[PDB]
């Protein structure tokens, strides 16, 4: 709560459930870490339409976050890597202040490049979720370097 400014109960990115603007905007208006799922925005039209819906639904001031599947290759190239749709939405002025990297941890140099790339445009919350103990110690190495 000291870092973000929001309540310590979160709302995870869920591909059937939190793929929808209604629940993620209500959880963000309640003052909580809400997280729009990334495994359902499969095309550019659907992505732009959901950004438009979220901008319609939030009140002034509130922000929301975003989940990005990493080892899904086409979806990762569409969201973050190849086209930069999250980055373009943030530069246009959407309220995304957080990207959650799910299902895998990148290596050292491209992970540090990803933190610096998102901190350039001003995402300022690049979080990881690890699976196993070695997956945890890799992120300890990230936060040390």
């Amino acid at each position: 709560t000291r870092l973000t400014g929001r309540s310590p109960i979160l709302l995870a990115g869920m591909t059937p459930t939190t793929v929808d603007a209604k629940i993620v905007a209500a959880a963000a208006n309640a003052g909580h870490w809400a997280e729009l799922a990334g495994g359902g925005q499969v095309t550019e039209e659907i992505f732009g339409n959901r950004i438009e819906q979220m901008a319609g639904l939030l009140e002034p001031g509130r922000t929301y976050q975003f989940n990005a599947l990493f080892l899904d290759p086409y979806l990762w190239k569409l969201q973050v890597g190849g086209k930069r749709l999250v980055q373009k939405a943030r530069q246009s002025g959407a309220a995304i202040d957080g990207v959650v990297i799910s299902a895998g941890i990148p290596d050292l140099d491209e992970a540090v490049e990803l933190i610096d790339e998102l901190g350039d445009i001003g995402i300022s919350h690049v979080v990881f979720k690890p699976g196993t103990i070695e997956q945890i110690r890799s992120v300890i190495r990230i936060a040390t370097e």
């Binding site: 709302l11 995870a12 869920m14 059937p16 459930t17 209604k22 629940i23 209500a26 959880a27 870490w33």
Partner: protein
């Protein structure tokens, strides 16, 4: 699950079952307990089945089902959890 369990993971009181000091943490994330909410857009029959089911606390071995839930295989071979119904029966049959 219950907010009592959320508090006992947040306060660090969960470690005395293993005989350690208090190991507090600073946030807990809730996915599944928000599936049956108002703004969520599952089907109301799915919400009713999701209320009416109750799940175990122990592990579920792969390709079996213990008490409402089940664990089966996916498109690529990865493991997933399912509610034991007509989807899951056909899923483990195609797994065989």
């Amino acid at each position: 699950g219950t907010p009592r369990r959320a508090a006992e993971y947040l306060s660090g009181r969960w470690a005395q079952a293993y005989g350690f000091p208090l190991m507090p943490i600073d946030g807990i994330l809730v996915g599944t307990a928000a599936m049956a909410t108002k703004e969520s857009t599952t089907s109301p029959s799915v919400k009713r089945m999701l209320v009416d089911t109750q799940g175990t606390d122990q592990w579920i071995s792969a390709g079996k089902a213990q008490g409402g839930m089940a664990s089966s295989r996916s498109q690529l071979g990865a493991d997933i959890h399912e509610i034991d119904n007509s989807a899951s029966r056909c899923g483990r049959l195609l797994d065989e």
